[PDB]
Amino acid sequence: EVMRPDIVIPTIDTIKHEKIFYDLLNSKRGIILCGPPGSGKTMIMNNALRNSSLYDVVGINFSKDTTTEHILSALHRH
Amino acid sequence: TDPGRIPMSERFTRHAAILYLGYPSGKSLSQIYEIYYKAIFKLVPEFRSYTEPFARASVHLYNECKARYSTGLQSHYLFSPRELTRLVRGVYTAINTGPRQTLRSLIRLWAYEAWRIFADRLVGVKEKNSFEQLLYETVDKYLPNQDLGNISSTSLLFSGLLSLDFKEVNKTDLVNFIEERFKTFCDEELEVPMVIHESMVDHILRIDRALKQVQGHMMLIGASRTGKTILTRFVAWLNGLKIVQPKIHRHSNLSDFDMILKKAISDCSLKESRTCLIIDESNILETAFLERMNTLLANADIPDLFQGEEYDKLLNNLRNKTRSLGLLLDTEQELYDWFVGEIAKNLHVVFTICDPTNNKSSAMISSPALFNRCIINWMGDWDTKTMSQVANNMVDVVPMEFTDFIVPEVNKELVFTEPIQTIRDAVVNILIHFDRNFYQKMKVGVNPRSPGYFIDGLRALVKLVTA
Amino acid sequence: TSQELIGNCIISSIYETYFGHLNERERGDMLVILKRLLGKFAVKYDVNYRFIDYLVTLDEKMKWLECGLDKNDYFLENMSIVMNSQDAVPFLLDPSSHMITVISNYYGNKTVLLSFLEEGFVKRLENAVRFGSVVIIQDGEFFDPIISRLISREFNHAGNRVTVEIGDHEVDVSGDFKLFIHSCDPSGDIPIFLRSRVRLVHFVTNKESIETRIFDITLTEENAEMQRKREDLIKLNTEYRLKLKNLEKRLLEELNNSENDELMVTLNNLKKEAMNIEKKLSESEEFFPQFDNLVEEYSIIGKHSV
Amino acid sequence: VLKWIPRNLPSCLINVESSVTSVKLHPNLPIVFVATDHGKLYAFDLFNYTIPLASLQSHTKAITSMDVLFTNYTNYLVIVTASKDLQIHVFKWVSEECKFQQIRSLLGHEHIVSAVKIWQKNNDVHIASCSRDQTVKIWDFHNGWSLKTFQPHSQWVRSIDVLGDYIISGSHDTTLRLTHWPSGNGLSVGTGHEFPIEKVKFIHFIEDSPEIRFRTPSTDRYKNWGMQYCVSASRDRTIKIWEIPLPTLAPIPNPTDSNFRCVLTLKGHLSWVRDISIRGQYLFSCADDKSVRCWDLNTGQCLHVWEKLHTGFVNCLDLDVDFDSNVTPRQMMVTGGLDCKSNVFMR
Amino acid sequence: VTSVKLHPNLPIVFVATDHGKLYAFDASLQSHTKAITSMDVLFYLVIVTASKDLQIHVFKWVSEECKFQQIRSL
Ligand SMILES: Nc1ncnc2c1ncn2[C@@H]1O[C@H](COP(=O)(O)OP(=O)(O)O)[C@@H](O)[C@H]1O
Ligand SMILES: Nc1ncnc2c1ncn2[C@@H]1O[C@H](COP(=O)(O)OP(=O)(O)O)[C@@H](O)[C@H]1O
Ligand SMILES: [Mg+2]
């Protein structure tokens, strides 16, 4: 199972962070995750999204040559 | 703070809350990698009790490597827990395809994986000496086991070529096998007079290790004429991969790059044949090619490559291939993510970088979609033992000992070759000393030194002394 | 002359590769430290070593002299570096673009001029390498990666014929073919892939070449008879050595079996040639210190001029 | 008497100055012919292995494959040595003089040739060879010229086998394909290996045996066609036995049955398998792990392993022909070696 | 011929002439300028040649390349 990148290991920090992301996402407020590149922001955010039954996942990865067309097309998918 | 990240205005962060996700502490990393090593050691239950020392050793070694080698020394010393995760995955894929394991063999396997995931990016020789001292300290602190041999990179040669399983192999047997297989490779492919030495054996082993993993990509950093792409072609011929070579001249644009990428992707998916993509430094003219590599590597494919009629014919070809293999896939999402799984499983990209101090090379190695998802291999310059071995192997053909040569009593550090007995060792030492003095006196600084001058001088020397 | 072969031959192999792209002062200093390194490791070498007198014989020296090359020693050494690179393709860096005519005179009508800025470059290049004509390329600062297999010489020996792939298909090559690259701008950036695989030779003119050229002009003008005498003695010494070698071969072929007047005449001619050689050596022994006095005399003008 | 297994130790060692490439057997006298990488063709005698009978240098380049056959007219011996000098050579053995007698050299290949075969069907001897020219070539031994040249594959074929009027050809593009001999039409194509095919040969008929699972025909179509089962050896460390399908009997390919079928796969070699030679119930094969293995057809497991037979790569094996009544299958088998040695097992 | 030698493994014979030239007939290299005295061969193959020129040169024979390459001289 360690080959699959979606596997998470629950500790106190990631469960406290999952609680805060649920609290802010239920508060209709934008959330900005800003940390060093090894902190696993994408992994913990997908962990909070996929295990839940109240939120969904869209795959958007920004780049230098990215406009609102990609965002709008990803919006039409769901 | 790092370059490539444009600071956004406060008007966008006005309406959004902000968080800082710091690095996990020692206890959290320790517990997470206890869980990882318990999962890995479930394969071999005889060493189940060693889960705590291995996780403690990995966490402490990562912390020491982060504290010692910083960003100030080199721009690519950005360590992360992702390297620890890659270490765990490498240990798993070595144990799973390995023989009956032993405690000494397990420690050697972990040491080899740490060598190939943690200190294959180091530059200075004293940095590698500090790393092997760190390995000695970590092993003697957390795994107090005797009867353990050398942990240096020459004595840790784990290969899958010589057997059916990932196991340690003898040095001379591996050297003979590489010699004969490279002779067969030169017979069956392009011919190049490459000499065999232990540093290239270690490099060819680590690039074979990197090119056998699922979604395995790496970037090779080293001076020119070090022999990078020939080693890449040698491994990709050993593993049955197909070489695709981007033939890009000066009168080239993004259309040729896109059509080569499209042909490679179509041959990877529809024809189900694995391919190796050697992206050279000179093959990236503008930043659009770097953006295309970012899209191809951070994700699994390029969504911008197939649009409209191209997208429709791609989906038609994917449906035809799925119906040919008799797989019940109907929705477009299943076909698309099966296709990107096929691309991520059957496409390996490698990079050859000549001068890392260039602005284009700095932008390449500072890219966020390249540094994290590729194994940084630093070939660097040639150390003195490699030069001595190459010169000894190249001057032995010609008769050279025909003069009354007396042994000169010189200093210990002034002799790089094993101590002088014949005129050949003196000639090799003279050549290496002149090369070092010449590269010192031209003020090369920290730029890599291309060893092609040494090989050209050796060839001219043997031809001229023959005449 | 045999106990120091490995010391003199290792200098010239060093001299070909490392010293292609240096000025006179740095080249002299590196030769000094090379002599120091050779003397340190107990490898003997000729104390009166001269690279032109080591590799460049008189015939090739004249043949280079009336093809357009100047009489400077630095240009002669660089030309010897260029025309003794059998394995590595040479690179020419001359701001004046003077020596295109030199290689055209040396290779005759076989010289075909090509440029990286052309549009039919690939077709005429593949036709020329199928023929085997010598090819000279201009605009070396605009290197095009389509000749990456020609620069690295990664030919595959497919059967009895040697094979290369250029561009997008298969072309055949011949043993007559030789490639040359010429560049105009000295400050033009060169790719590292091209730079590390060619013999980069600098045909430029620096302040040390100002000193050398002013020395050459003041010796060929102030005391021209001395330079004429030096050239005459060198030419007669070479001619007498060749004649003595030919006479020795003829004498050995005549007297290999078993006396007559033919052997006695050959012995008398050999005695006369040996006496002439001894007289020439005695004359030339006491002439170099005059040149030493001249070079100790005409250095203040060089310092003033620089 | 067909279930002989060679002993563990070599009977005697044959010393060669360079790398041994192809080894053959004389079907009447105990004489072995040993190739070299230097191109020299030897002829050792098993009783006295001190000096060769006739050391003839025929080519400036290496030689790759051989074939030997004692003809039966309605007689003498023919040795062919395919080489790397763009041509092949044909030799005749003289028993009275004990020296090689050259006959002719067949030309036509535009690259180096890697396979050669010689046989007879009805009072006419034919020679086949296959090269890096991607084309299968045929010759007439008495006439001297070719009959049919054709390319079956995009990449270059490596090894072949033949009986009657059917030719299969392993290729560098990891695909097998039967090529019909008169018509030149590909009856069936095969896939399933992951590496180029080193050696490949047919499995033929036998008269009487207790029980067979890999040589006996199943139906009357197999019985009168006579071509049922083939075994292929390829660089993916595996040996497989392949079912060949029926044609639309010039025979036509079957549109729904023009694909091969792998029946039994064998694995355990530590490097590339190089050559195979079936002998009754036992599939003798080599590898590049300094070893020669013995595989059974029925149980599909290696009964005997010969570990560290040489200090280097093992190149080629060859046996005596057993599916014909002209030549008895004597209990002799000899191997080659990259480390300049050749070993023969007897009794 | 001043000395005769034979290959102990393959059918090769080494012949040394009185003028110093050595021929390998189943190659022609002049190991010593003067007349050679005697030779010895031991199995890599090393051939030691001694002559009257106060210089003993040792040469090795490459079986695959059919050429002799000198290793060292006393
Ligand atoms: N709490 C945790 N549980 C499991 N794995 C973790 C945890 N924290 C970090 N990791 C590891 O750290 C790595 C961070 O990778 P990634 O999510 O790509 O970083 P980022 O999100 O910054 O791009 C992952 O491979 C993950 O396995
Ligand atoms: N001992 C050696 N080590 C490294 N390179 C060598 C050696 N001998 C020759 N070479 C040269 O190196 C070239 C291959 O290096 P390559 O990987 O192409 O360098 P780069 O990666 O800078 O393009 C060959 O063309 C060959 O001429
Ligand atoms: Mg991140």
Side-chain angles (χ1 to χ4, degrees), chain A residues 1-64 66-68 70-78, chain B residues 1-26 28-139 141-145 148-270 272-285 287-308 311 313-315 317-322 324-327 329 331 335-403 405-417 419-467, chain C residues 1-70 72-186 188-221 223-224 226 228 230 232-234 236-237 240-241 244-245 248 251-252 258-260 271 273-274 276-277 284 287-291 293-295 297-306, chain D residues 1-95 98 100 102-120 123 125-164 166-184 186-206 209-219 221-247 249-251 253-255 258-307 309-346, chain E residues 8 11 16 20 24 27 35 50 55:
Chain A
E1 299 291 330
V2 305
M3 320 294 307
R4 296 192 296 113
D6 58 337
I7 287 310
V8 299
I9 306 302
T11 183
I12 185 168
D13 278 15
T14 175
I15 201 66
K16 180 181 77 174
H17 283 316
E18 281 159 306
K19 184 61 69 178
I20 190 169
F21 295 121
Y22 284 140
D23 276 335
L24 280 168
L25 212 54
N26 268 336
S27 283
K28 271 72 155 196
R29 198 78 264 156
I31 299 169
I32 296 301
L33 280 67
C34 188
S39 175
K41 324 160 301 297
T42 303
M43 162 283 308
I44 191 167
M45 186 60 237
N46 290 327
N47 184 24
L49 277 194
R50 202 68 60 82
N51 78 325
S52 185
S53 73
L54 282 72
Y55 297 121
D56 281 317
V57 178
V58 291
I60 301 175
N61 204 357
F62 278 168
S63 66
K64 293 183 184 297
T66 308
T67 59
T68 80
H70 309 151
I71 297 169
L72 188 64
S73 185
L75 276 157
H76 309 336
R77 290 212 314 270
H78 308 85
Chain B
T1 64
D2 60 333
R5 301 293 194 271
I6 298 168
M8 81 196 48
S9 66
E10 291 196 30
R11 304 157 57 85
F12 168 63
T13 70
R14 203 262 181 277
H15 314 84
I18 187 164
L19 281 81
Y20 170 77
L21 295 176
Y23 279 147
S25 64
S28 182
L29 277 182
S30 299
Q31 294 147 356
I32 289 157
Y33 284 80
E34 291 263 31
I35 304 302
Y36 282 166
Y37 280 159
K38 260 149 180 172
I40 304 316
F41 279 0
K42 210 155 84 172
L43 281 174
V44 287
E46 277 74 25
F47 304 96
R48 178 199 52 250
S49 57
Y50 286 100
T51 308
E52 168 71 90
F54 267 99
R56 198 66 67 83
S58 282
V59 160
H60 157 266
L61 198 150
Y62 152 76
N63 279 328
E64 288 262 41
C65 285
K66 184 153 192 52
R68 277 191 160 125
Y69 319 127
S70 70
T71 313
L73 294 191
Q74 282 283 345
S75 68
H76 72 307
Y77 286 173
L78 304 179
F79 286 143
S80 294
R82 205 196 280 100
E83 322 278 359
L84 275 167
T85 305
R86 275 215 295 281
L87 157 71
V88 161
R89 299 218 192 98
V91 166
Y92 166 67
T93 189
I95 292 172
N96 178 39
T97 69
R100 167 78 179 98
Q101 283 286 338
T102 318
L103 159 77
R104 175 185 178 270
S105 180
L106 261 173
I107 293 180
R108 282 193 106 80
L109 190 49
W110 170 87
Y112 169 75
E113 272 315 300
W115 253 112
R116 296 306 177 264
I117 208 64
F118 277 147
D120 57 341
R121 77 187 70 207
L122 302 193
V123 190
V125 64
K126 67 156 295 182
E127 271 156 332
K128 273 165 177 162
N129 300 336
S130 287
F131 186 82
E132 71 180 2
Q133 273 320 293
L134 178 55
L135 269 173
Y136 283 160
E137 286 168 21
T138 307
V139 164
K141 203 159 93 73
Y142 295 125
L143 303 96
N145 181 35
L148 172 62
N150 194 2
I151 321 292
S152 190
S153 303
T154 76
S155 309
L156 295 189
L157 301 187
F158 280 87
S159 179
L161 322 170
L162 283 198
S163 52
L164 282 162
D165 48 354
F166 201 88
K167 74 173 184 45
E168 196 172 4
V169 290
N170 213 351
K171 169 69 163 302
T172 66
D173 291 331
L174 195 55
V175 164
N176 290 350
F177 178 76
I178 290 300
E179 268 202 351
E180 177 56 43
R181 277 302 178 231
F182 193 79
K183 201 155 306 190
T184 308
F185 170 68
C186 278
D187 174 42
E188 287 182 14
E189 295 295 315
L190 74 164
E191 190 264 349
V192 53
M194 263 305 317
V195 74
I196 304 297
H197 42 93
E198 95 277 20
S199 168
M200 184 179 72
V201 172
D202 183 87
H203 285 118
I204 197 68
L205 281 182
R206 73 178 48 169
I207 188 173
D208 173 56
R209 166 208 175 277
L211 279 185
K212 212 153 209 193
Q213 277 190 352
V214 185
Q215 203 185 359
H217 322 290
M218 91 194 307
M219 293 183 285
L220 295 171
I221 316 294
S224 183
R225 263 180 99 184
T226 310
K228 306 190 275 280
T229 184
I230 178 62
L231 291 192
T232 302
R233 287 181 65 98
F234 184 46
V235 159
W237 176 81
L238 276 176
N239 288 342
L241 313 163
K242 165 172 92 193
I243 299 298
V244 59
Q245 190 73 256
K247 305 142 102 173
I248 294 168
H249 39 275
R250 190 175 65 85
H251 295 285
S252 294
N253 61 6
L254 270 297
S255 185
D256 317 313
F257 202 65
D258 291 331
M259 75 179 72
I260 297 299
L261 284 187
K262 188 190 195 303
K263 189 193 180 330
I265 287 306
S266 168
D267 291 330
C268 182
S269 163
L270 282 72
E272 77 207 81
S273 76
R274 309 167 296 281
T275 50
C276 175
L277 182 61
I278 298 92
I279 296 297
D280 291 331
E281 178 78 9
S282 73
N283 288 36
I284 306 302
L285 313 162
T287 62
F289 313 99
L290 185 52
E291 169 57 26
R292 202 79 61 183
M293 293 297 103
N294 281 30
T295 303
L296 196 142
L297 261 71
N299 304 7
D301 69 323
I302 306 175
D304 316 319
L305 183 53
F306 299 95
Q307 282 297 326
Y311 191 79
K313 67 176 68 76
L314 178 78
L315 266 295
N317 284 132
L318 263 293
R319 179 102 56 188
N320 287 16
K321 195 77 208 187
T322 317
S324 314
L325 301 162
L327 267 75
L329 265 73
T331 179
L335 272 74
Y336 202 65
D337 64 3
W338 178 85
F339 157 77
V340 310
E342 266 306 287
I343 300 299
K345 207 190 60 200
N346 284 8
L347 178 89
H348 315 265
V349 69
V350 287
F351 289 76
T352 72
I353 294 192
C354 291
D355 214 340
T357 196
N358 209 358
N359 55 352
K360 178 133 57 158
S361 313
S362 164
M364 201 176 268
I365 72 167
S366 308
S367 188
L370 275 296
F371 180 74
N372 56 352
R373 229 176 308 277
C374 293
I375 319 180
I376 293 288
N377 191 18
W378 195 282
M379 313 264 267
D381 304 289
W382 268 6
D383 51 355
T384 76
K385 54 179 185 292
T386 308
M387 271 175 178
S388 180
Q389 279 179 226
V390 168
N392 271 121
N393 215 333
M394 293 178 71
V395 307
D396 275 337
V397 193
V398 65
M400 185 179 288
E401 321 196 21
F402 63 94
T403 61
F405 180 47
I406 77 184
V407 169
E409 267 318 295
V410 294
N411 207 328
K412 287 323 180 283
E413 71 256 29
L414 290 197
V415 189
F416 310 104
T417 297
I420 317 161
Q421 291 167 325
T422 53
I423 194 73
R424 284 176 169 105
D425 312 340
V427 167
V428 169
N429 285 288
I430 282 155
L431 288 163
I432 296 172
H433 266 289
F434 174 76
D435 195 273
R436 273 173 91 88
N437 275 1
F438 170 72
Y439 273 140
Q440 181 181 320
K441 269 206 175 72
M442 299 332 304
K443 301 285 103 176
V444 72
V446 288
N447 307 291
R449 321 172 151 180
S450 70
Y453 281 150
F454 198 63
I455 310 149
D456 273 351
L458 280 168
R459 282 179 193 135
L461 165 71
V462 57
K463 180 189 74 174
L464 206 62
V465 76
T466 287
Chain C
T1 190
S2 165
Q3 261 195 10
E4 61 185 2
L5 179 60
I6 204 55
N8 308 323
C9 188
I10 198 172
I11 292 184
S12 162
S13 179
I14 295 299
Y15 187 79
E16 283 204 359
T17 50
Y18 289 87
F19 296 157
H21 54 88
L22 300 174
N23 44 21
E24 162 68 25
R25 177 71 69 89
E26 275 166 336
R27 184 176 296 178
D29 275 336
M30 296 297 172
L31 210 64
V32 161
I33 76 163
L34 183 65
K35 287 174 174 149
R36 190 250 291 182
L37 275 172
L38 264 184
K40 158 180 305 173
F41 279 85
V43 178
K44 290 171 70 177
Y45 74 108
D46 209 349
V47 290
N48 302 134
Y49 164 90
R50 296 279 316 302
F51 174 76
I52 307 105
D53 295 305
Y54 195 42
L55 278 178
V56 176
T57 64
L58 276 297
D59 194 14
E60 51 200 340
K61 194 171 171 180
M62 310 303 325
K63 181 73 171 151
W64 290 356
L65 270 177
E66 310 82 22
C67 279
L69 200 69
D70 312 339
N72 204 352
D73 274 9
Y74 174 73
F75 270 60
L76 277 179
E77 291 164 18
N78 279 6
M79 184 42 159
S80 174
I81 285 184
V82 167
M83 309 217 78
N84 218 359
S85 304
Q86 305 286 339
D87 52 345
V89 61
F91 201 101
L92 308 166
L93 194 144
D94 166 16
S96 161
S97 77
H98 158 81
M99 66 179 289
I100 302 300
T101 61
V102 171
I103 313 188
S104 307
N105 292 356
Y106 197 84
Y107 283 80
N109 62 323
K110 311 302 178 206
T111 290
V112 189
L113 268 299
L114 278 81
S115 159
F116 281 155
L117 271 300
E118 279 199 359
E119 311 312 303
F121 180 75
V122 184
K123 316 293 301 308
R124 68 186 308 196
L125 182 54
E126 71 156 50
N127 292 333
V129 68
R130 261 189 303 258
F131 186 13
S133 64
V134 63
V135 179
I136 304 184
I137 313 284
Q138 291 183 232
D139 291 331
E141 62 293 7
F142 286 95
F143 171 71
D144 190 74
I146 211 69
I147 52 164
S148 178
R149 220 59 52 78
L150 293 174
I151 298 298
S152 177
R153 286 187 185 267
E154 293 179 353
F155 315 125
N156 53 336
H157 303 336
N160 59 332
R161 53 181 186 90
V162 62
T163 300
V164 78
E165 64 183 1
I166 297 168
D168 50 346
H169 67 91
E170 160 64 33
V171 292
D172 304 274
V173 300
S174 81
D176 196 315
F177 162 74
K178 295 177 185 179
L179 195 147
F180 281 77
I181 309 186
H182 187 282
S183 181
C184 311
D185 47 352
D189 178 47
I190 177 166
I192 177 65
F193 160 71
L194 183 63
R195 164 70 162 279
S196 66
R197 286 171 166 81
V198 303
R199 192 77 43 85
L200 179 74
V201 184
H202 276 192
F203 284 95
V204 289
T205 303
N206 302 115
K207 331 288 191 53
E208 286 83 9
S209 62
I210 300 299
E211 299 181 356
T212 313
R213 270 153 202 277
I214 278 172
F215 182 77
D216 190 19
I217 291 177
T218 194
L219 273 70
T220 189
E221 196 74 31
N223 323 301
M226 179 143 169
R228 277 137 179 79
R230 159 159 92 189
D232 281 351
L233 62 84
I234 287 306
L236 69 90
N237 206 341
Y240 288 160
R241 180 157 289 114
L244 188 152
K245 275 305 285 281
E248 200 44 69
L251 188 152
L252 265 174
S258 82
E259 203 269 339
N260 52 350
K271 165 70 205 284
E273 290 272 80
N276 193 359
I277 282 294
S284 297
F287 200 73
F288 162 74
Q290 280 283 84
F291 270 115
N293 187 23
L294 267 188
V295 66
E297 183 85 26
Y298 293 153
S299 282
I300 53 170
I301 183 168
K303 281 150 53 59
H304 273 267
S305 57
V306 69
Chain D
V1 287
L2 274 76
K3 51 200 82 54
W4 159 70
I5 287 303
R7 85 181 64 103
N8 208 10
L9 276 297
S11 168
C12 76
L13 190 141
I14 294 182
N15 262 297
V16 177
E17 82 303 344
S18 64
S19 172
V20 174
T21 311
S22 305
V23 189
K24 278 325 191 205
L25 277 297
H26 181 191
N28 292 339
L29 280 294
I31 297 169
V32 286
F33 320 110
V34 178
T36 62
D37 207 323
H38 201 37
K40 274 186 161 184
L41 157 65
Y42 288 166
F44 276 78
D45 190 90
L46 283 192
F47 300 168
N48 44 0
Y49 58 94
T50 65
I51 48 156
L53 266 296
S55 161
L56 188 152
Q57 169 97 47
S58 175
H59 315 91
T60 57
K61 278 308 212 166
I63 69 166
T64 304
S65 75
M66 291 181 182
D67 198 358
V68 54
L69 186 136
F70 202 69
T71 178
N72 180 29
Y73 284 145
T74 307
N75 284 300
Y76 62 92
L77 185 133
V78 174
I79 278 174
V80 291
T81 61
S83 47
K84 275 186 173 164
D85 65 338
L86 275 284
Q87 45 164 359
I88 81 174
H89 271 220
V90 182
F91 293 94
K92 173 176 56 141
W93 182 264
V94 183
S95 55
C98 305
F100 279 121
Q102 211 272 346
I103 299 186
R104 55 205 310 158
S105 82
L106 314 173
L107 314 189
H109 288 306
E110 61 267 17
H111 214 274
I112 62 170
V113 57
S114 294
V116 75
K117 273 307 184 300
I118 191 178
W119 65 92
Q120 64 183 357
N123 65 8
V125 181
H126 292 171
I127 293 179
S129 89
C130 293
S131 316
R132 268 176 96 180
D133 47 14
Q134 295 104 306
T135 51
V136 174
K137 277 221 182 191
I138 193 66
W139 274 271
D140 202 303
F141 175 57
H142 293 115
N143 201 5
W145 292 271
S146 55
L147 262 71
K148 180 66 68 68
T149 73
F150 62 98
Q151 61 88 30
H153 296 80
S154 54
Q155 299 253 30
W156 61 274
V157 289
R158 305 192 85 263
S159 294
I160 42 171
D161 193 22
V162 63
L163 183 62
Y166 297 93
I167 291 179
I168 62 170
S169 81
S171 312
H172 201 77
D173 204 72
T174 190
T175 54
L176 277 80
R177 179 194 295 230
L178 163 55
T179 60
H180 209 259
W181 185 97
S183 78
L187 281 183
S188 49
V189 291
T191 314
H193 282 299
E194 280 96 1
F195 264 112
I197 319 296
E198 285 276 334
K199 270 285 291 188
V200 54
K201 54 174 53 180
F202 277 150
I203 321 183
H204 284 154
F205 282 19
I206 52 175
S209 291
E211 78 267 11
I212 308 297
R213 78 141 304 170
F214 268 123
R215 304 162 81 83
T216 43
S218 87
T219 61
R221 328 179 60 78
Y222 281 163
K223 180 67 174 66
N224 58 350
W225 203 33
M227 293 307 207
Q228 295 82 17
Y229 293 8
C230 64
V231 57
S232 68
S234 70
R235 289 175 174 180
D236 50 358
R237 313 213 271 256
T238 61
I239 302 153
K240 296 183 187 347
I241 297 169
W242 278 36
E243 182 78 31
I244 192 165
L246 275 301
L249 192 146
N254 207 313
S258 68
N259 203 351
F260 274 70
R261 193 167 89 246
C262 54
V263 181
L264 170 62
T265 175
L266 303 174
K267 44 194 63 156
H269 278 310
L270 266 73
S271 285
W272 309 346
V273 60
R274 299 297 299 272
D275 210 300
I276 54 189
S277 179
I278 192 66
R279 179 180 179 84
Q281 310 322 281
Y282 297 87
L283 183 78
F284 294 87
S285 89
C286 46
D288 277 354
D289 54 1
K290 319 172 288 298
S291 79
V292 166
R293 274 188 152 82
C294 179
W295 303 82
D296 203 334
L297 289 184
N298 306 333
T299 183
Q301 174 214 0
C302 58
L303 274 72
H304 296 285
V305 64
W306 280 275
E307 186 44 76
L309 191 46
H310 295 255
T311 61
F313 286 179
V314 178
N315 294 113
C316 273
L317 274 295
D318 203 280
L319 274 295
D320 289 21
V321 59
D322 50 353
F323 41 83
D324 57 355
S325 301
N326 188 24
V327 166
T328 183
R330 307 162 307 193
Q331 305 153 20
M332 283 186 308
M333 174 214 89
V334 62
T335 184
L338 183 63
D339 48 347
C340 309
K341 289 176 173 61
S342 161
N343 297 92
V344 54
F345 310 143
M346 278 187 327
Chain E
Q55 193 205 299

